[PDB]
Structure formats: C-alpha cells, structure tokens
Amino acid sequence: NVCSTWGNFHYKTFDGDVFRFPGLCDYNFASDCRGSYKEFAVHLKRGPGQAEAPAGVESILLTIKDDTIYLTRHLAVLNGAVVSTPHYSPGLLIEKSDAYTKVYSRAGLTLMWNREDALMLELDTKFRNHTCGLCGDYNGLQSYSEFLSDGVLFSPLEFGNMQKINQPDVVCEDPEEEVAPASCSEHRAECERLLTAEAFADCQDLVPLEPYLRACQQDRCRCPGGDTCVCSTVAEFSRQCSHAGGRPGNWRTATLCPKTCPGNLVYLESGSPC
Amino acid sequence: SYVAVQDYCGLGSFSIITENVPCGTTGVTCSKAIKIFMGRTELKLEDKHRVVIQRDEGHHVAYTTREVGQYLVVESSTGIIVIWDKRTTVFIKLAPSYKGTVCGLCGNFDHRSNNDFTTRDHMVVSSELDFGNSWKEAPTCPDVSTNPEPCSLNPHRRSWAEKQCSILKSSVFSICHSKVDPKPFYEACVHDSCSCDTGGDCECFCSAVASYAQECTKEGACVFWRTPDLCPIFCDYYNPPHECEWHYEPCGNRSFETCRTINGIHSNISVSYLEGCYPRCPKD
Amino acid sequence: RALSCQTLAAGYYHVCPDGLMDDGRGGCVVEKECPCVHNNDLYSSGAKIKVDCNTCTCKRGRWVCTQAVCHGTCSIYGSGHYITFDGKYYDFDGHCSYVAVQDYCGLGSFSIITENVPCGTTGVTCSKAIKIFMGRTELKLEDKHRVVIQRDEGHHVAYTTREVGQYLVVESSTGIIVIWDKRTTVFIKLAPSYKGTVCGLCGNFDHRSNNDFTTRDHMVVSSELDFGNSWKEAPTCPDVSTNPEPCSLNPHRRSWAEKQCSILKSSVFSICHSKVDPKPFYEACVHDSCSCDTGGDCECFCSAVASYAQECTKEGACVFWRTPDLCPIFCDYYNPPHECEWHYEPCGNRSFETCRTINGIHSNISVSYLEGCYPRCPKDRPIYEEDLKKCVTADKCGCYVEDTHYPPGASVPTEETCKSCVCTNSSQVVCRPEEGFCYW
Amino acid sequence: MDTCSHLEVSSLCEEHRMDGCFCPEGTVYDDIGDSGCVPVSQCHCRLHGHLYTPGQEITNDCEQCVCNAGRWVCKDLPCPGTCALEGGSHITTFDGKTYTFHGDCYYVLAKGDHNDSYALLGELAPCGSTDKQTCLKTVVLLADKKKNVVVFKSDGSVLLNELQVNLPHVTASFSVFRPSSYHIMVSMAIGVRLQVQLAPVMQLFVTLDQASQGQVQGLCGNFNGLEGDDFKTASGLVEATGAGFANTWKAQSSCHDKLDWLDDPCSLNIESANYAEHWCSLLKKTETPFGRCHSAVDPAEYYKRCKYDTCNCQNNEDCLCAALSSYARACTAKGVMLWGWREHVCNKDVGSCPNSQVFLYNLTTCQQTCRSLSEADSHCLEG
C-alpha cells in the first residue's frame, strides 16, 4: 500500500493510523527488517523549523541494496556524483518533473516527493511483515503492533522518538510532550464542507474520510490566519483520490489557495503528464 | 533514450527505443536496455530477461520470444525481429513491406545512403552529432559536443589492446580475409578495449571478436577460434550429471527438432549462424 | 554442578542430575560416552578423522592421534602475498630476483629462486618465473613451460615433471616438491628431513614462528621491508620503502572489486565458513582486483577465488562455484571430435591408472585436491599416458627414460657409448651393444 | 664474485668468463664498505644504517648480537609476554594472533595449568542495542589456591570476597594499587601482573614472565612461540575460526554458542563512515603527533580496528578515544612516548583535572602521597 507524510507534521502508515509527530532531527521513514539482508531503507530529514504553518524536508537518503540516492531541494546525487535527470540505469529510474520528483526501482519501490512538504512511498506486497520504519509494519493490521506491542498503548510522540537515527557529530533534542490542547471540533463543519465538495465526487468510495478530516481539525486551529495549512490536506486527499484510480475536478479558486504558472498554462487535476 | 526505429514519421504502428548509459570514464556510452512498443503492448529487454508491460486486453499482436545459442530472439507476426546478445549488441531486422517508411538512428531503409542523416524535422545534415542529438527523447538530456578518443585518454592500456585485437589480422582468420574487410572491426576492438577501464575488460574483447567471427560464418567461413586460454566457453554445465548431450557448436549450422517446429510453427528468417551451445538429444 | 562435555576442562567456577552430563546432542549421557567436537561438527565416540598426514579418534570426549611429522609448505601468491613454513602471512612488493628458499644457510644441496616484476601501474609486483638449482642441474619454469639448463653430465639427480589438473608439478627424489599454476601461484613442499636447515623468504621451518624474519646475516628484525630487502640477489636492484595501496590509488575500480570479491562471503561458500577463515582471502581478492589496471583483470580474480576454493577442498568441502557467467572453464576442448571423456572435476577426488603407476612408480604426496579437467578413459584402452594426454592400451604407452617420453617402438636416444636402445612393442625399453672398438 | 654479503655466488654461476678487473684468489670484494678486495675477516656489519665494526656489540629487543666476520652472532635474552583484551572484543594472545569474538558469558581468560596456581576470568556481554556491540563488564581473579576471589567492576568498587575493600591493599601473596583513580594495577608474587583501565572503556593487560612458557591455557593462548597452535582446544585438535575455539572455554554451561560475523560495520552505518574515516585516518599522517611512532610500530592494524570500532559502537567518540589510546600505549612501551597527543581529539577531560591536578603522561606508581614516601619501599612494584 502507500505510506504518506504531509501538512503540519501529519503522517500516515501503511495501515492508516494518522497521527502527528513534530520531530525535527532525523528519522527512519521506512526500512526492510527481514533480518537476513536489508533490501532498502528510506531515511527522512526534517528541517530546522520553517515556520508555524509549514513543515518542510531538507533532504532524503535512499539506499537500494547497492547504491545510495541523496535527493535535495535543487539537485540529486547518485553514488556521490551529480546526475542530470532523468537517468535510465537498468535497475533504477530517477525523473524530475516540475511538480514532483519520482524514483522507480525494480525491487518494488516507488517514491514520489514534491520538493516542499508532501512525500509518499509505495511498496509491493512482498515486504509484508518486514517493514520496521516510522511507517510501522506492513502486516495490514490497523494499529495492531505499531502502538500496542506489549499491551502498552504507545503515544505517538514516544513511538516516533524511538525511530531516531544517531548522527555521531551533532546532538539533537527530541520534542517535549506538549500540553493536551482542546479537541478542535469547533471547525468540523468547515473541514467537512470544504473536503466533500463537487470536485471530489468519484472518490467517496475509494478513500475514507474520517482520518483526513480529523487531520483538518487540528490543522484549522493550530494554524491561525493564512490558509496555508488547511489546503495542504485536501491536496493530499486529492492525491490519494488520483492515485487510487479516480479523477477529481477543479477546486482551487482565486480565493482558495490558488496557484500560478507562466503563460496560458492552466492548473488542473488528473491530466496526463505527457 | 534515443529512437532506434519508428514509423511515426510525419499514423505508424510501432517503435523501438534504446537506452544508452556511460560505461567507462572516458565519456563513451553503450546500450544497456531495449524497449519495444507494438500497438499497445510494451516489451522490455533488460537484466538478461524479457519483461512484459501494458499487455493489451484483446489485440495482443502475435509475438514470440525464444533463446537461440547465446542470443535472445523476439519476432513479431507483423514483420519485425530483434536479436539481442544480452550485453550490448542488437540487430533489428525489418520486412521489405516497411520500405521507405521509417525514421530514426537506423536511417529510412530506402536503398539510398546519402539521405540517412535526416533529423527529426526532415532536414538533411552533414554532422553526426547534429543528426544524433535530434532524436533524443527527453528534452532535458544534454547534447553531445565531441567524440572522445579512448586510447588517447588511457595511454597505458594501449599496448595490451593493440596486442590482443591483432588476432583479427593474424593467420587464424586467413580464410575470412577475402570475404570480410577486417579493418572496421579491428578499429572497433581497439576502441572498445581502451575504454573498459572500470572492471571486466575481458568481456568487451570477446564480444568484439565474436562480432567479426559471426560475419565470417555468415559469408561461408566457419572458423574455430576459442581456446582454453582465449575467451573460453563452458557448455557442459547444462548436461545432466554425466551424460554428454550439450556441445559447443562453433557456427551453429545444425537444424534439429523442437516441439514448436514439430507442430508446423516456423520463423521467417534464418538464424542458423548464431554461436553457442546446442543440444544433441538422444534417440529415445 | 552441571557439566556439559564442553566445560570439562573449564572447571565449573561460577537439567541433568548428578553423574550424567549434558552432551549437547540431546539427553544426558555418562562421562564415558561423552562425544567430541571439531570445527562445529559433533562426532560420537569411537570415530575416525585424518589431519593432513595422521589419523585421530574420539576416545572419551578427547582426541587421540598418531604422531607423524607432516611435510612443510610455503605459499607464494597474488601481488606479493607470502605464507612461510610456520604460518606467518605477510606482504612484500619487490622488483628483483629473491631467494625463495635455499640450504646454503651459513655445504648446501639446492636453492629455489623467484623473479618478481611489476604488474600494474600502482607499484605492486608479482612473480612470473621460477628457477630450481638441484646439485648442478637448473630447471626454469617460464612462459608456461619447463626448460632444462646445464644438465649435469652423469649425476642427473632423479626428478619428475608432470601435469595434474591445471597445475604443473615438479618433484625431486631427494624430497623437494614445487607446484606451479603457470600464472603466479607457487607452493613449495619439503620433507621433514630438512627441518631447521633452510633460510629465505619462506622462513626456516622449525615449528616456531617468532624467528621467521631472519635476515641474510643471521639477525632477527621486526620489519617486513627490511627482511625482504636483504634477500635480493643483484646488489644493484633498488630497495622497497613503502607498500602501495591499490584501491586507494584507483578509486574508480573499487566498486567493481568489492562486488565481485563478495562471493567469498556469500551463501555459495556457506559450507566452508566454519573450516577456513575467509577474511584473509577476501582482502587478497580486493587487493588484487584494484591493481590489474592494464588489461586482463578477469584473470586476477578467478585465481584469487580458486586459491580459497582449493583450501576448502583440502579441508573436506567440495564446492562447485563456476558458472557460464563467472570464470568459465573450457574442458571438452581436449576431447576427440565428439566422444566425451574429459570432465571438469570440481575437487579432483579421483584416482585412475596411468602408465607410470602401472609399473610401480609412485609419488610421495597426495595431490588429489587440485582443480581442473580430468580424463575418464574408455574401457577399450584404459591407461592414461601423461606426456601426450592420451588414453591408450596398457601395451602402447611409452618408456619414460631420463624424464623424456619415447613412443613404443621408437629408437630410444641414449647419451651412452656403443649402447643402442629401443622401446619394445611391450612398453619395455631395452638396450643392446654394438661392436663397431667396444663390446657388450 | 663474492662480495662480503652475498657469499657463495660462484656455486650458482650460470655464465662463462671474460676479461675485467677482478679480485685475488681470496679477499672477497668489499660491498658493505667502500674499500677494495679486502680479506674475509674484515667485513663490516650493518643494521639499519650505522656501519658496525667487527667487534662492536649491540643489544636488540630480546637478544644481544656481536658483529663477527661479516655475520652477526646473536644470543637470546629473557623478555616477558603480554596478553591484551581491548575494545569491546579484541584479543591479542601472547603470540600476536589478533581476532574478534563478540561473546556473551563468563570465560577463562588465563589460568595456570598445574592444578591451583591461579585463574583470571572476564565477563564479555552485550553492551548496546544489538548482539554485535559487546563490552567487558567484570574481571574476577581466583588466587591463593583458589581460596581468594577478587572482583573488579567497571565502576571502580574493587571488592574482595564479596566485601568492599580500601586501596592500597598489600598482602604477602599479592598486592593491588590505584595510582590515578582510572587505573588499577595488581601484582602477584607468582609472576603475573595485571593492568585494568576504567576509562573510557574497560580493558585488560596481563603480563607473564618467561619462565612460564607453555604452562598457561585460556583465551590468551599457550605462550610457546608458535602462533598457529593458539587455537588448540583443550581436547586435542586445532580449530579454524575464532569463535569455535573460544566457545570451549565457557565458565558457565548454560551459556549459548556464538558464531563469527562476516560483515563490516562501516557498511551498515553509512552516516558514521565519514566521521570514522576523518579521524581514524590521523594515524597515518606523518605531521601529526602519532607520526613520530611510525618508525617503531606500524599503525595499519590500529587504523583498521579504529575504523571498525568507530563504525560499530553507538558511543562513537568513546570508542574512537579508546582505540586511539591503545596505539599511544604500545608506542610508549618501546621508548617513543607521544607527548601532548590530547590537544584536538580526546581533550574532553584533559582540562577537567581538580584544583591543583593537571593531566600528566608519565604518572607512575611511586609519585604518590606523603605516606608513600613514609615507607618508600613497600609499594613500588616494577615492570
């Protein structure tokens, strides 16, 4: 299935289980804990804190069984050498569109990342019962062992803290437990109305709704003022809509997180990149 | 990724693409995978295997994949054939019905060789680098500016390369000297041997010599050039424990009975000149 | 108090009841029937195994072995890797003629020299020829052939040259043996009568390895580059100062070398992991692959892997590691047109009949563990003649006089006077006198 | 020609003769010096440079030699042996033979074979997260006919017979001292000497006299001069790997058996490889303070082990400093003493010394307090 991360430190494992882990140092996004041989490992690196609303990513390290890919905001490095995208090796494909950077591997790994905040990873069914990264395991169980391993119901923050990676030159402090804020249920109507619009007709049966609106709940209250933090969720909802097989309409208006491109190029959803 | 062949030439039915990547440190590049588009089906020859993709629902233009000698052969019922040696060599064979209806790096197959440098926009140019650069697939790919000289950038490897490749001009291939001009193959051997400077340079040389030996066979000169010290081949690996039925056939001139031809299935070309190990199945 | 047949000698300082002790195989057993262990293998009581010249027996959980002195072995291989008679690995990269072994140690009976030359551009050097001085005769192994020089008039110390598997074996009746793979590897074997009376790059063979760095003038040093430099032959040859690091001087070749040489650590050699430590062979493989940067680097790798496969065979693990894409071997080239008799024997464990051993001649070492292609002569002419590599009848093989093969019937050359010789039609060399003065 | 070093050339002469300048019947040509065809009994010896006359003596490491006519004549001198347990798992026997174990049990490091003389144990156990990160946790000594058990834990807190003890503690049979609060030095009248280092990582050094050659068994070998029978089990034959031999010396039957580990930690933790290299490579830099020792002790093995330890363990700086402080002990045993090598790398505690205390490199035992001078001969163990 798909593991995803977006928005204001919003995460989503291979079995749903949407939570919020505002870590900032470095983490093991995904890995292959088969025990015998590690096929792949995806390591995520957050930023120093861009601002209150956004939550970017500095760089991504991705090793597949012999080679490492280091993806930054502006350039991609393969085995210590800068490569002019796209690249067509017989076991690995890297391509750099304007809206995404995509990596395809023959082992059954697909990675898609827009250079600012949104990242998603897809694995085949071969790696079930073996994933051990921050995306939880891939047994298909809904929060079975990710949070309740030995009877103790792990809180999201402590579960995320265990997935850290120790860089032996810098000490980075883990985030402290924040005071439990009020359940931002006063903005539920706004989130439900915005998300369940007309442009999202033919995906109401492909993707659920509860998790993505619960995510909008905190997003709306935790992010006062500009709506740079709520429309980053419905974007993820649309991406999930498009990835399943559906086709959304157009929802971005001139007053609802619009976007601009040079010339008469028209911003759309669900159109062929070719 | 460059267009090897296609008939979407100015609405067409197929296309064959190639994927070149660097192999060495002198800047030269070599083919490492092949992609075949036929109607809607897409085959990919890669990592010593054939992989099917986007197989169409109910058209499935009849194609056939099999392995002959050391080569892998793909044939399409429409009249296209691709022969791949699994490392770098590719032969594309086209029916005569596709005459003067193709474009790409392989020219337009019109029995006229003063117009094969036709760019993507139907201009005839005089520079190799201008005809080549116009058939790239991704616009962001860079443009080639010069042809590097391997033996000049790696002087210390020249002495070896010029010594091993000299077998082409030696008395071993004396029968073939009057039937194939060896100079363009000697130059290819020397050029390749000076460039494989990152590992496994005994595999660049054997293929180079085999390319010329194959033509010598094709014109009617079957020559036996492999020795236990020069590009050895290990055929009896395939035999059952100690029954001897696989044999190295120097020039493939042997026709036996498979379970395809036993039911009337036949090809449309002769591939009876491909090197490799062949069976000699028993009489029971 | 819980003994386990493995803590017997420990002491139990810090389940089964009193008496019986755990055996590690299952239920509790008495001390008398306690088994033995060796190389991660569990042998019951009363078993038998051999160690390179002897035989042992698991008696009471303890091994009892015969006491005979095995031969001594020195190894030279790769781009300057040496193993002395007493088991002390080291490296040395010289460009001159060095004394591999000799008996003129401060009057002597032999000497074995070597010729190291540069191979690569990183400064490393490798052996490419051998010279053997025996009495006055001088053999030279060179260009994949053996050349006799200065053959003495009438002493002609008995030796024997033959070809087993992929290797060339030269034995001497005195007790010296040289095994050469024809590219760079060399094994020198000595009988136990030379103990503590030799000197050279291979140590002095006295079952004591803290004094194998003895220089030419009987001084014990602690540096490889001083021990090596003192055994050069021509005084004008230069002196080595530092050991080159190939993979550091050729960074772009590392990725390949570390990927091909990784097979040693893969599952293919899983059987041999508990019997031979692979690390000192993996290091040599990587070191050799980074250096062969002037051509033919697929040959530096196959020999490196074969050096370890041979030891695995020698210790009792026959492993089949060649494939049509990895160091292929072309054996049936030797067969007649299409009759199939030559077979690739992965670990050489075959004892057939030649026309030497048919007449009672026997060697003194077991070379039944050398890789290569071997004959399987048919049942209508089952005697393997070696000097022509031919399966022939027991009658028409040869004569093998003065280390020179002569076909049956052929008039045998003779360096004597008035003595003509002929190989009979019965594989018998017989000589007659000629009274043309001289008599019988 | 015979040239005063390469004697008996003529016996291997594969050439015929011609004219030229030669030497008389005797008086082999002088090669080491620069004179002419001098007699045989004037050959000057050499030893890494200096030209020694025929009659000048010298004393090498464990032997003394005299320049006879062209060739040295040497005679052995007594010199003891040393076993070392360093890093998490790195054991150097009395005859070299380095190997890596990664065990988990009590083990018999070394014990006199006769029946009772002594015994020295050591706790190797998992130390971090995985099984491949081990440590030494406790040293147990069984002496006085195995009627006295002394325990050293890795927090100080030395204790005798399950009872805390005060230092110094001198007895008739052995003695213990603690000169600098991070080093515990024990001497035994039999001929055994122990050094225990408590920071940054616990380590052990054992030294034995040369009158006990072949009468010791344990993980430290037999100490007989041959380093091929070191893996010779206590039940006959010799083993091949480093873990197979070690398992046979467990002090607790309940422990399991381990196997070798065919991997390099610098390939599993990529983020640490650059750090490990950038610092451990200092050992080969001639301009660096360690460059001085290059003359005496080769640094290659220490460099490789430095990379191994820095990549493997999770306290990378602590392992780096522990590995880097083993080279500066081997070198400080052959004269060359590395002064002021803590200025860039492991100065984390150099400036933390108390009020009047300062970091010293030659802090020997008898630089002690007033009472040490009060006796001045009770506790000045040598060696």
Ligand SMILES: *[C@@H]1O[C@H](CO)[C@@H](O[C@@H]2O[C@H](CO)[C@@H](O)[C@H](O)[C@H]2NC(C)=O)[C@H](O)[C@H]1NC(C)=O
């Ligand atoms: C060799 O060429 C002939 C000529 O087309 C192929 O025969 C065609 O087969 C397809 C389906 O098998 C039919 O739809 C065509 O009508 C046939 N052509 C003709 C002219 O009748 C034949 O298939 C080719 N060989 C192989 C192995 O496919």
Ligand SMILES: *[C@@H]1O[C@H](CO)[C@@H](O[C@@H]2O[C@H](CO)[C@@H](O)[C@H](O)[C@H]2NC(C)=O)[C@H](O)[C@H]1NC(C)=O
């Ligand atoms: C194997 O070793 C024996 C032991 O010496 C060799 O036998 C010697 O042979 C020579 C000449 O053939 C005799 O002069 C010696 O007297 C023999 N030795 C003894 C002890 O009698 C035998 O030759 C060796 N094997 C080979 C093939 O040479």
Ligand SMILES: *[C@@H]1O[C@H](CO)[C@@H](O)[C@H](O)[C@H]1NC(C)=O
């Ligand atoms: C393990 O089995 C398969 C993969 O092997 C997976 O689909 C399933 O969910 C897993 N179940 C458990 C209990 O781990």
Ligand SMILES: [Ca+2]
């Ligand atoms: Ca789950």
Ligand SMILES: [Ca+2]
């Ligand atoms: Ca044309």
Ligand SMILES: [Ca+2]
């Ligand atoms: Ca010795």
Ligand SMILES: [Ca+2]
């Ligand atoms: Ca020993």
